[PDB]
Structures are given as structure tokens and as C-alpha cells.
């Protein structure tokens, strides 16, 4: 079970409830990793929103 991920690519929000993030940011799961859109909190920027699961990998 993984709850901390690292952005592989820059992501710009496409709807307001998305989280924008830059490559290399650490992103903390708020609830769970079910489905394709995960509610996450950036440990870099402090912002919270949905992230696309294919843009991140476990912080290894």
C-alpha cells in the first residue's frame, strides 16, 4: 500500500478540483488510490486536489 507519490510530468489542472503540480513534487494521498483520479495533497506546494494516476509513481 503506497500513499506517497512523485510527479513524473508537469500537470496543469483541467477543472478546478484538479491539483496542478510540477514534475518532481511529492504528492500525498488523502484517502485512497482506487480508480484513476486520486485526491492528493502536495508536500511541495500545500495544495490539494485530484491527480491523474498515470502522471505519478511511488516515491521510491
Amino acid at each position: 500500500s503506497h500513499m506517497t507519490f512523485v510527479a513524473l510530468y508537469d500537470y496543469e489542472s483541467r477543472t478546478e478540483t484538479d491539483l496542478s503540480f510540477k514534475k518532481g513534487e511529492r504528492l500525498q494521498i488523502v484517502n485512497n488510490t482506487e480508480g484513476d483520479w486520486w485526491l492528493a495533497h502536495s508536500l511541495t506546494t500545500g495544495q490539494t486536489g485530484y491527480i491523474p494516476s498515470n502522471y505519478v509513481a511511488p516515491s521510491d
Binding site: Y9, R14, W37, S53, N54, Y55
Partner: peptide, 8 residues
């Protein structure tokens, strides 16, 4: 960068 998954 890949296309997004199916949107909410």
C-alpha cells in the same frame, strides 16, 4: 506526457 484518464 500521456493523455489523462477518463475524466470525472
Amino acid at each position: 506526457a500521456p493523455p489523462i484518464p477518463p475524466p470525472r
